[PDB]
């Protein structure tokens, strides 16, 4: 009898929470019915790629618990997520291990 | 509203069913979801005023996704969201 509307969409993000944030967020006078359904799937998809990539990062550093260095390495090793988050500072993030080619010992 | 950490953790167990996440890494993912939320909704609100409308529909968000997400992130998330809407209306 409950049948939460996120479960009708086959998602995991709360559609009813998003619909509440759209209405009291002062975005428009009205919010359509399909709007928070469509938005919650997009927010699910974006987390589903970062956690998939950062999960591969921690597996490569032989750790089973994602810490925010792995979020830094997962984002900056793309070109789409890097373009999306080009002006984002991550706490405890660090820098990619990049050294310029001129700054290397010759021969 | 206080967090998304329950919902983030459900996706994480769905993708990598063995890995975990620290609290500091959860707080970044919590701040991440809130950032794109008013990136999309804050910009899809501007599409309503540019067309003199008053409702935000799925069509208003679908074009707002195509503005924000670059490259193949647009081509997947649009295809992702339309699966959710058609499943929602059919059920």
């Amino acid at each position: 009898k409950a049948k939460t509307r996120s479960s009708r969409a086959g998602l995991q993000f709360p559609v009813g929470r998003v619909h509440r944030l759209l209405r009291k967020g002062n975005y428009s006078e009205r919010v359509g019915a399909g709007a928070p359904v469509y938005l919650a799937a997009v927010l699910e998809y974006l987390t589903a790629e970062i956690l998939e990539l950062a999960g591969n990062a921690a597996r490569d550093n032989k750790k089973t618990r994602i810490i925010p260095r792995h979020l830094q390495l997962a984002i900056r090793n793309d070109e789409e997520l890097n373009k999306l988050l080009g002006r984002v500072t991550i706490a405890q993030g660090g820098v990619l291990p990049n050294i310029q080619a001129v700054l290397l010992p010759k021969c | 509203k206080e967090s998304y950490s329950v919902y983030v953790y459900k996706v994480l167990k769905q993708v990598h069913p063995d890995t975990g996440i620290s609290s500091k890494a959860m707080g970044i993912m919590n701040s991440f979801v809130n950032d794109i939320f008013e990136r999309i909704a804050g910009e899809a609100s501007r599409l309503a005023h540019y067309n003199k409308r008053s409702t935000i529909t799925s069509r208003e968000i679908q074009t707002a996704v195509r503005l924000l997400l670059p490259g193949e992130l647009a081509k997947h998330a649009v295809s992702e969201g339309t699966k959710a809407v058609t499943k929602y209306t059919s059920a």
């Binding site: 998809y45 589903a48 790629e49 090793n77 | 993708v15 997947h76 992702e80």
Partner: peptide, 14 residues
């Protein structure tokens, strides 16, 4: 596999 057709990774294995 959770969602391979949904996610994007084609090139390359890094």
């Amino acid at each position: 596999h959770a969602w391979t057709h949904r996610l994007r990774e084609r090139k390359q294995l890094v």
